[PDB]
Amino acid sequence: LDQLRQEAEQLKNQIRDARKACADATLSQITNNIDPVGRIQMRTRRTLRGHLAKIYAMHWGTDSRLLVSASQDGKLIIWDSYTTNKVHAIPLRSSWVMTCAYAPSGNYVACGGLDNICSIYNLKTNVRVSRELAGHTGYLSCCRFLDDNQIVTSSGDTTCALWDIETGQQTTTFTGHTGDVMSLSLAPDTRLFVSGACDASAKLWDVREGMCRQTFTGHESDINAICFFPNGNAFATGSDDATCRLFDLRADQELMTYSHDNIICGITSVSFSKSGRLLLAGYDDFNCNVWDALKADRAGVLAGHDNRVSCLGVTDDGMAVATGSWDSFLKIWN
Amino acid sequence: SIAQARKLVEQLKMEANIDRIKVSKAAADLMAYCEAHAKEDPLLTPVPASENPFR
Amino acid sequence: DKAAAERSKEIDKCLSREKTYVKRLVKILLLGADNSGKSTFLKQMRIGIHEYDFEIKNVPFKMVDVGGQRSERKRWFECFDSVTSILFLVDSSDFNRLTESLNDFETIVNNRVFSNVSIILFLNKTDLLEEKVQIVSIKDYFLEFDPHCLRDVQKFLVECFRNKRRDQQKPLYHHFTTAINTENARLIFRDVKDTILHDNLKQLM
């Protein structure tokens, strides 16, 4: 055991030099004369309301029009962004929900929280539970619909697992992300997904198998959120070190770190723009800082929330960005 | 936890041979995607009010 | 075209209908141990997180109970940042288990998340230690502490828990009660009423 423990260290040293060996130049160096992003003077084009308590989760839909949201009131509200009407209000068996998800088909909505079970609500029939999952050891942190039939989850047990409504049992669980996985995202090509945990590192996983292939790291704190580039080739992890950063698959290393001297609050949600030029990122300073993804320019500010912003999302159509804050409000920015 | 110890080295070995391309080549790839779809971004270039649902 | 607006109006009623209840609801976090006799304490209120909604003197409450599910992750604690007090139970007679109870108190009361909340300290088993007093000297274990007087022993436990709090945004309470005392619910009502009074006073002046 002692020899194996010492042997494990020397493998990473070569792997650490592998990033150095493949490194060519800093992305900043790569992008010096690239067109300036310009001042995006975005304003508020909608302001939804009706949530009793603070919002923790919000996720758009593939139909570009409906968006779901969850709060400590124990209710899920489905909103029509175009017309600011309320479609469904979903009571929950529990009252401590920490994540929500929307089916691309639109017939189901996932919700989970401190309860070990995240509910898969049936939306097409008001709304009832299609299936309540078997459960994990801790609390579900982020739920996403890989497809209408497969569900991927992140819990408080350093455990992620692909699910299945048909069998009602986790088909292929995933283990290895020490700490507490709190973030999860899916690739536009639905065969990969990564996660972020309190281990100050993120790991890349393959759905068809159950073993991770890559492990991006360097964060000075716990990762609270993550999202993928429009192509399946980049990342954006937002941790509590007040520094989002860009990652690359083939590079297997960070490209640029997004931080500003007056920015010490931290990050709660992160999302890209449709063109991949902008890195929309919320902050615990009750603000939403937009950044040039191609560059590192911290250009584009989006203020107007009274309390912390915790959830952020960009429509698949790319028209508008949505922010939900602890103020119990959720307003669409375009 | 020998198995676990076996797992880490095994995992390290799995990624020990990670295939990789030039970092600049991957970095330059991000430039092409950003440039190609810049004209079709409803959020970067200000949206024409004639079709914006939030205008 | 009209059912969409109709659904909103019907939905907005229930959300508005529930606002009065939620805004007036009092949430209390219950933390303790197996020796604290929570099951014995909870039955008096009747007359892994469990929800106990009760009402004495025409006011609702919420005994949210983290059944040993205490987590270290920070995001766990903002799931309970909406509470207005924390009811804390320790077995007074369990002298040998006071060391872990002392350490347990530090994590909750001194976490920046649960700040702005009051602490309602309870010392159950108030008659079990009665005999221990003058029989087993708490000073034999807590050398920092006459050892055979109840009042000195009774007041020594509070000084340990009270001083274990770090730097006082909200006051700390203490009540020595039996597991079957009929005044238990009354004591919380007086303590929670004072807790919201201080909050309102800030706002007012």
Binding site: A303, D306 | - | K23, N200, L201, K202, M205
Partner: protein
């Protein structure tokens, strides 16, 4: 002078000193208007935050606006020719707005109670009655007041109701009722805040002082002229009321300042 509001005994005063009471009433009531102008706008502009939008700040704003118009409506009632029809036209409005001004003091008083001695439920919305007794009850009295003695308006030295057929009672008696309750609320509130002012004593003095402009306990000195020394005390205690609302609930409140500092951040970062 502003002291005519509470007069119930027709006492004469020295014409040399008449300017002295009128001068303080002029400057006192003039500042109370302009100083309240900032209060109304700063509540609207800072209404973008939760610390401002609340069940109470509707009370302060409505009271501020009711006193705002009532004060400024009084300046034009002085210079306006006594006894004429326009004097009778607009002196009804002084009776209604001051009664509405006092109604909001009681609403503020009835809200101090539910937050301090009836602490549980202090956040439940009760706008259906606060707006009701805030304006509807003053309207109910004025219709009775006008029907009983419409002629009472004017028909005297000045456009303020004459103290002859008891017309003065239409405003003085309801003012006394609002004073008594607010004094009663103030005592109970002071008892419960003084108890928490034990050794750890100027806090208990500031607590009552900030409640004077919103409870209307300074109008007691108005009826005490029955003598002239209290008339002077009535021409500077409530005459400059608008200044007191600004300096205790608009420019010195921590909540309004915290709301202000938040809005300077969003405006600068835009």
């Amino acid at each position: 002078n502003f002291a005519i509001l509470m007069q119930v005994v027709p006492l004469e005063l020295a014409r040399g000193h008449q300017v002295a009471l009128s001068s303080i009433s002029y400057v006192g009531c003039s500042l109370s208007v302009l100083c309240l102008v900032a209060t109304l706008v700063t509540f609207a502009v800072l209404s973008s935050v939760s610390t401002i939008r609340n069940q109470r700040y509707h009370i302060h704003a409505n009271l501020s606006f009711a006193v705002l118009v009532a004060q400024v409506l009084l300046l034009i009632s002085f210079r306006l020719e006594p006894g004429t029809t326009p004097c009778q036209v607009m002196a009804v409005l002084l009776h209604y707005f001051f009664l509405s001004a006092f109604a909001w003091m009681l609403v503020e008083g009835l809200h101090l109670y539910s937050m301090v001695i009836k602490v549980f439920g202090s956040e439940d919305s009760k706008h259906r009655y606060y707006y009701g007794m805030g304006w509807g009850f003053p309207l109910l009295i004025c219709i009775i007041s006008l029907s009983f003695a419409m002629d009472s308006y004017g028909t005297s030295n000045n456009c303020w109701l004459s103290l002859a057929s008891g017309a003065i009672w239409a405003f003085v008696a309801p003012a006394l009722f609002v004073i008594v309750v607010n004094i009663g609320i103030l005592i109970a509130v002071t008892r419960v805040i003084s108890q928490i002012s034990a050794d750890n004593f100027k806090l208990t003095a500031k607590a009552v002082a900030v409640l004077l402009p919103i409870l209307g306990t300074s109008w007691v000195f108005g009826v005490l002229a029955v003598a002239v020394v209290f008339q002077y005390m009535f021409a500077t205690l409530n005459s400059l009321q608008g200044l007191f609302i600004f300096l205790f609930h608009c420019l010195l409140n921590s909540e309004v300042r915290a709301a202000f500092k938040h809005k300077t951040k969003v405006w600068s970062l835009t």
